[PDB]
């Protein structure tokens, strides 16, 4: 039973041989056979894992945005042993923070809140492409990249509400 | 039974064992990869180094080209170089992160951020970020510490500079509200008529 | 008596049982409809998916073309497609609603409502 292991659905296993080191292939789902006490497996998730990355980001107009990005990412099946050796099972908390923060900050520094909201497609495409490019090096596919939680400072909210109140004051007056 | 137990050891999880031989100390050029290996019970006492890159956050105020303090916090991800596992230890010990990273990172911050002003530093944050990344890579290269990625995780200023920028936004908002005041004046003029 | 008990199972109430084979994992293309079926005691361990369409209420502030936040909560009634029961599981797991609907619905709302004013 010690050498009898099984990997659940939507998951992959990376096997390490003590006498030969890490593997160069990844086995599929379901129970499999291995040499006791020499071939130790590690189970990784192939199902799309969601993650939210709330952050305050400084736009070029020096008005920070409290912005949350939701990304459905799963590791590349082929390169699972590579990432495991490079960083280990703590591959998200050791990589995702830095890449997410730098990508979002670089995207935001291009424009300001007005330019952020006026063109959602531009920022969405920018973040998606940049994150995919960054994760290509780290070999973690992004099942879905989506930004869905926007919040600004009270000053820009004051500006928008001033615009709207003047517009309504037109009709009221 | 304990003779074999203390004689052969397995290294796993991206860790490397360097043998501290009693003949002359650390046995140079005998580095070994993951797997299983034979360790002498007494002469060779391996030291295990975790190769997985360990990020670290440094919070250190630094001066800018505007002569204003900027508490920029930087996250750096790095791992030891496989080629020079022994010598670094010989000149750095088992505790090298806290022995090297602070000095290099803070000196680079002070010598780089000082060349930019707040507005330029933030608007061109990518330029200064990549410049500091290259500087950190070059500096830590001598220390055998491969650098995986250098990024800026936070940047803050004195509350007075932020008050000044908030007042700039206030001025913009007021110069915007002025035209709405003009329209209100037009309507009030019609009412008066 | 327990050999037969664990060997044959009945699926009812618009539910689908997909067998998790031990040969290679999920038994693809072995999907079955309501009724009675033979489940291997060990190799095949079925997972039951409720076909019955379920609703979900999503509340989330969304920006508009007027740059104002509107909390336009939306209710969606959805069920898994009967023709792709295994693969979705293989890539989603047994909890796909909370894993998919939030992202897609919130992104769609932000990209649709943002183009219009109140």
From Swiss-Prot, chain A:
GO terms for cellular component: cell surface; cytoplasm; early endosome; extracellular exosome; membrane; mitochondrial inner membrane; mitochondrial prohibitin complex; mitochondrion. GO terms for biological process: antiviral innate immune response; B cell activation; cellular response to interleukin-6; DNA biosynthetic process; epigenetic regulation of gene expression; mitochondrion organization; modulation by host of viral RNA genome replication; negative regulation of androgen receptor signaling pathway. Keywords: Acetylation, Cell membrane, Coiled coil, Cytoplasm, DNA synthesis, Host-virus interaction, Membrane, Mitochondrion, Mitochondrion inner membrane, Nucleus, Phosphoprotein, Proto-oncogene. The keyword Nucleus applies. The modification Phosphothreonine is found at residue 68. Its main location: mitochondrion. This is Prohibitin 1. The lineage of its organism: Eukaryota, Metazoa, Chordata, Craniata, Vertebrata. The chain holds residues 24 to 196 of 272 of the full protein.
Curated annotation (Swiss-Prot), chain B:
Residues 118-142 are annotated as: Necessary for transcriptional repression. Phosphorylated. Tyrosine phosphorylation is indirectly stimulated by IGFBP6. The modification N6-acetyllysine is found at residues 115, 168. Keywords: Acetylation, Cell membrane, Coiled coil, Cytoplasm, Host-virus interaction, Membrane, Mitochondrion, Mitochondrion inner membrane, Nucleus, Phosphoprotein, Receptor, Repressor, Transcription, Transcription regulation. The keyword NAD does not apply. The modification Phosphoserine is found at residue 119. One of its GO terms (biological process) is negative regulation of DNA-templated transcription. It is found in: Mitochondrion inner membrane; Cytoplasm; Nucleus; Cell membrane. Expressed in myoblasts. Residues 89-92 are annotated as: LC3-interaction region. Induction: Expression increases approximately 3-fold upon entry into G1 phase compared to other phases of the cell cycle. Also induced following inhibition of mitochondrial protein synthesis by thiamphenicol. It comes from the Eukaryota. Changing residue 45 to K: No effect on interaction with MAP1LC3B. Residues 158-193 form a coiled coil. One of its GO terms (molecular function) is protein heterodimerization activity. LC3-interaction region (LIR) is required for interaction with MAP1LC3B/LC3-II and for Parkin-mediated mitophagy. Belongs to the prohibitin family. Protein with pleiotropic attributes mediated in a cell-compartment- and tissue-specific manner, which include the plasma membrane-associated cell signaling functions, mitochondrial chaperone, and transcriptional co-regulator of transcription factors and sex steroid hormones in the nucleus. The mitochondrial prohibitin complex consists of two subunits (PHB1 and PHB2), assembled into a membrane-associated ring-shaped supercomplex of approximately 1 mDa. Interacts with ESR1, HDAC1 and HDAC5. Interacts with ZNF703. Interacts with STOML2. Interacts with ARFGEF3. Interacts with SPHK2. Interacts with COX4I1; the interaction associates PHB2 with COX. Interacts with MAP1LC3B (membrane-bound form LC3-II); the interaction is direct and upon mitochondrial depolarization and proteasome-dependent outer membrane rupture. Interacts with IGFBP6 (via C-terminal domain). Interacts with CLPB. This is Prohibitin-2. It comes from Homo sapiens (Human). The gene is PHB2. The chain holds residues 33 to 225 of 299 of the full protein.
């Amino acid at each position: 039973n010690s050498a009898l292991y099984n990997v659940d659905a939507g998951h992959r296993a990376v096997i390490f041989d003590r006498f030969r080191g890490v593997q160069d292939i990844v086995v599929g789902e379901g129970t499999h056979f291995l040499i006791p006490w020499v071939q130790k497996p590690i189970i990784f998730d192939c199902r799309s894992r969601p993650r939210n990355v709330p952050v305050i980001t400084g736009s070029k107009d020096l008005q920070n945005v409290n912005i949350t990005l939701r990304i459905l990412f799963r590791p590349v099946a082929s390169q699972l042993p590579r990432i495991f050796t490079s960083i280990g099972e703590d591959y998200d908390e050791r990589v995702l923070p830095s890449i997410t923060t730098e990508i979002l900050k670089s995207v935001v520094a291009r424009f300001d809140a007005g330019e952020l909201i006026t063109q959602r497609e531009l920022v969405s495409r920018q973040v998606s492409d940049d994150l995919t490019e960054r994760a290509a090096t780290f070999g973690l596919i992004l099942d879905d990249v989506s930004l869905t939680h926007l919040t600004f400072g009270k000053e820009f909210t004051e500006a928008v509400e001033a615009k709207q109140v003047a517009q309504q004051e037109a009709e009221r007056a | 039974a304990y003779g074999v137990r203390e004689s052969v050891f397995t290294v796993e999880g991206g860790h490397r064992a360097i043998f501290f031989n009693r003949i002359g100390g650390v046995q140079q050029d005998t580095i070994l990869a993951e797997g299983l290996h034979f360790r002498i019970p007494w002469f060779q006492y391996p030291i295990i180094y975790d190769i997985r890159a360990r990020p670290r956050k440094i919070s250190s105020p630094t001066g800018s080209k505007d002569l204003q303090m900027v508490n920029i916090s930087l996250r750096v991800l790095s791992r030891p170089n496989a080629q020079e596992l022994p010598s670094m230890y010989q000149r750095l010990g088992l505790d090298y992160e806290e022995r090297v990273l602070p000095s290099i990172v803070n000196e680079v911050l002070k010598s780089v951020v000082a060349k930019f002003n707040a507005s330029q530093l933030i608007t061109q944050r990518a330029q200064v970020s990549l410049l500091i990344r290259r500087e950190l890579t070059e500096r830590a290269k001598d220390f055998s510490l491969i650098l995986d990625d250098v990024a800026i995780t936070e940047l803050s200023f004195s509350r007075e500079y932020t008050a000044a920028v908030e007042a700039k936004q206030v001025a913009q908002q007021e110069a915007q509200r002025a035209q709405f005041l003009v329209e209100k004046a037009k309507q009030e003029q019609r009412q008066k008529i």
